[PDB]
Design a protein around this ligand. Sequence first.
Ligand code: 8XE
Length: 345
Amino acid sequence: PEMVRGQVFDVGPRYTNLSYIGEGAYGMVCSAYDNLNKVRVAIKKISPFEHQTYCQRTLREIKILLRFRHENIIGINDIIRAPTIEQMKDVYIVQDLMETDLYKLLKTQHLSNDHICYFLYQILRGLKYIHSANVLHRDLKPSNLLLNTTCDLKICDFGLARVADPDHDHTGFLTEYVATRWYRAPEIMLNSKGYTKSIDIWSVGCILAEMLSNRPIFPGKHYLDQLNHILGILGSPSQEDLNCIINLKARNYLLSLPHKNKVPWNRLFPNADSKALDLLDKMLTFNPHKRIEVEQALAHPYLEQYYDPSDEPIAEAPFKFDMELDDLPKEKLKELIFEETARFQ
Ligand SMILES: COCCN1CCc2[nH]c(-c3ccnc(Nc4ccnn4C)n3)cc2C1=O
């Protein structure tokens, strides 16, 4: 029973020599050596039983990963848990280990156009699969994109993922959101619950911009400030864009703002590929209905050297509907997690 960052990892003795990788609100990620497999792996400790919201997120993450199988998406190799519900205090997800992530890479390394193009293709390829399953990632950011030495890319962290619900997306002005702020689409702040696929596309665009400059494009200091940054670059929303916002609080705030003109991408990224800037423009579109879709993004001239529809697979068993996990108490949710993880025992 080794310890990391104050946390006890009951993964011994099959897994030994734990090293810290990252943290979350209710979980921790470590690397370890898999005795009898002769390889180093990644192990995520999850402790969601004390909170209903966490139990919902856990069941969804596990359910998705267990059904997903794709080169550009992190899979589950094993799941460690106590033999009984009474003894089950945490859940350990074992995954393949990746050398690093894009967050770590961008802090130190300048990316060549070839790398940017290749990284972006792999993200969209993975995302095509995700969206074909009727799933939304809802937390795509550099620290959630893993890399190895040969530049293979894998999407990780399906903790905030859900089945898409387009008919129940509308909401009020400045309603609270759990996803990372810098990669949050403008509509989250104004009228969206983030239940549509276009939410992931915005994030990818934010990632593409960051790959171009090694700096976040919309670095809001806080929740209120995030929209300030987006509008500062994109400029004032058009009449057409404004008519899709029917919540009066949101629309009236937008109308109350001074006129601002759009800042051209070539002024922010003067060294960037002109085709890359074109694709970035369609990803970072204010109106979520006008925003480019994953399959369209792949067919974009910027990625023409990788684009192969036959080699970009989709899911065999897409999720029919989102589970009503919200209502269920921390107790029934635990029992469902227990049953989902039973096969690995
Ligand atoms: C508890 O947090 C939940 C959210 N979350 C945080 C970031 C993360 N990273 C890996 C992972 C998986 C495999 N390899 C790596 N490698 C790696 C990255 C950096 N440094 N290294 C070594 N990271 C899984 C997760 C994850 O799911």
